[PDB]
């Protein structure tokens, strides 16, 4: 029932970025969440989240080792930010951390690792 | 035994800032929280937070309408941020938010009224 937007980012950004996104697509699969994923890599921004998505969303997930292009799009959102290598290692901190921020009566930003 | 650092900020002179610091100082001692408060006003920055203070603080409170100088300093802190006239109208909202951010497992940033 929830709708999640996300951005995965790697400096080089072709390999480490796509597997993060794919994992999240199947995580959102399981928990039956709606999801739109933006990719930022050395081949540039793909599936760029329109600001319609971002405002329609209940929580954002920022998986990155980088200075997100247009990181400011997300300041008015509940979100969880973590590194690439952290989401891949153990992601159910992350998906649980997402469900906490999702549940929390307050509008929290949560940084992991 | 908990330790809080705080920054109150207002463009419109040294009047809207000190009562904010005032109320917080006595919100704190009542809860027996240690507290150091940085003031940023038309007279400049007073009792600026030592970073050893910021790095050993359990949580920061950012009472500001404006853009804090050294907003940089709190990126790795648990903190609650709100505007001055919001902290003024009803302050218990704020410290219980503070006590959640203090309680909650992860480094959460909380933007409030
Ligand atoms: Ni933040």
Curated annotation (Swiss-Prot), chains A, B:
Disulfide bonds: none annotated. The active site is at 10 (phosphocysteine intermediate). GO terms for molecular function: kinase activity; protein-N(PI)-phosphohistidine-fructose phosphotransferase system transporter activity; protein-phosphocysteine-D-fructose-phosphotransferase system transporter activity. The keyword Transport applies. It comes from the Bacteria. Pfam families: PTS_IIB (PF02302). The keyword DNA-binding does not apply. The modification Phosphocysteine is found at residue 10. Its EC number is 2.7.1.202. It is found in: Cytoplasm. GO terms for biological process: fructose import across plasma membrane; phosphoenolpyruvate-dependent sugar phosphotransferase system. GO terms for cellular component: cytoplasm; transmembrane transporter complex. PROSITE patterns: PTS_EIIB_TYPE_2. Residues 1-100 form the PTS EIIB type-2 domain. It is an enzyme of class 2 (transferase). Keywords: Cytoplasm, Kinase, Phosphoprotein, Phosphotransferase system, Sugar transport, Transferase, Transport. Gene3D superfamilies: 3.40.50.2300. InterPro entries: Bacterial_PTS_Sugar_Transport, PTS_EIIB-like_sf, PTS_EIIB_2, PTS_EIIB_2/3, PTS_IIB_fruc. It catalyses: D-fructose(out) + N(pros)-phospho-L-histidyl-[protein] = D-fructose 1-phosphate(in) + L-histidyl-[protein]. The phosphoenolpyruvate-dependent sugar phosphotransferase system (sugar PTS), a major carbohydrate active transport system, catalyzes the phosphorylation of incoming sugar substrates concomitantly with their translocation across the cell membrane. The PTS EIIB type-2 domain is phosphorylated by phospho-EIIA on a cysteinyl residue. Then, it transfers the phosphoryl group to the sugar substrate concomitantly with the sugar uptake processed by the PTS EIIC type-2 domain. This is PTS system fructose-like EIIB component 3.
